Symmetry: C3
Subunit: 114 residues, 3 copies
């Protein structure tokens, strides 16, 4: 699984430990080992949400399976909760796009997961 | 809806008001209230289009519905027009990927839109 | 086609000519003229793979067709190989997400490819 967060929050506001906390949380949530979790945080972005430049985030989670109605609700609660507690971003200023990737469309270690 | 522009145009060439203008134009184009529109501009990128480093942009528009043949043509005319007028990027050096997201696959406010 | 690499490798470790090399390689691999190939490299990223900050990359390849089981295996061997040779990233610390785009969902030159 891969989680990317783009945000206008400044780099200095990202706490130590944030990638590691995301990694462990996403391993637990998705049922995949932490060795398979990739995370990427991109602060200091030029963005607006609802025409306002208050803190906000535009995120993605890609996974081969483990994506669906109830699972994505659970991910959203988890991930909004973390963005709120660690980056002080209001949950209603977060969008997360979920992608259920076909194994044949995910490259790794010179091949694909198919 | 969420619109992201990645460009090699430098930050100083992005005019004041660009995110606001995109916000309002996309609200109008999609028929969604501006409170729903997120915009993100990423200047100064290391990118090439056709093997040339002249101004170019790689963009995305994600929306729950409001995506389809004729709509996407209309968005492209709108968005290439803005990139040409404001960032001096030629329309033939712009790619925009359109994504029709399922509401279940969009997180917001601790949940999803499903 | 459009290839994006996000990496924690620093900007100074990206060799001059890397974008051109990726352009040529992808033109050959996809069978498209180089004029259609767009490439984007984003170094110095805050990212982790498996909880570790050793060199890694999260990439995408979008193309209108030319995506499938065997092709994507081939692209992954090519692209992992280039990342390993040129950026010194281990292939087992690379994810590449492949996207087969509909021509109606790709904007260019004030319209779409449909």
């Amino acid at each position: 699984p891969m989680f990317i967060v783009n945000t206008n929050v400044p780099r200095a506001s990202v706490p130590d430990g944030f990638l590691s906390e995301l990694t462990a949380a996403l391993a637990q949530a998705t049922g995949k080992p932490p060795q398979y979790i990739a995370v990427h945080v991109v602060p200091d972005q030029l963005m607006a949400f609802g025409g306002s430049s208050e803190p906000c985030a535009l995120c993605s989670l890609h996974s081969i399976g483990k994506i669906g109605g109830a699972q994505n609700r659970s991910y959203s609660k988890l991930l909004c909760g973390l963005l709120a507690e660690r980056l002080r971003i209001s949950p209603d200023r977060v969008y997360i796009n979920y992608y259920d990737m076909n194994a044949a469309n995910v490259g790794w270690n010179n091949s694909t997961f198919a």
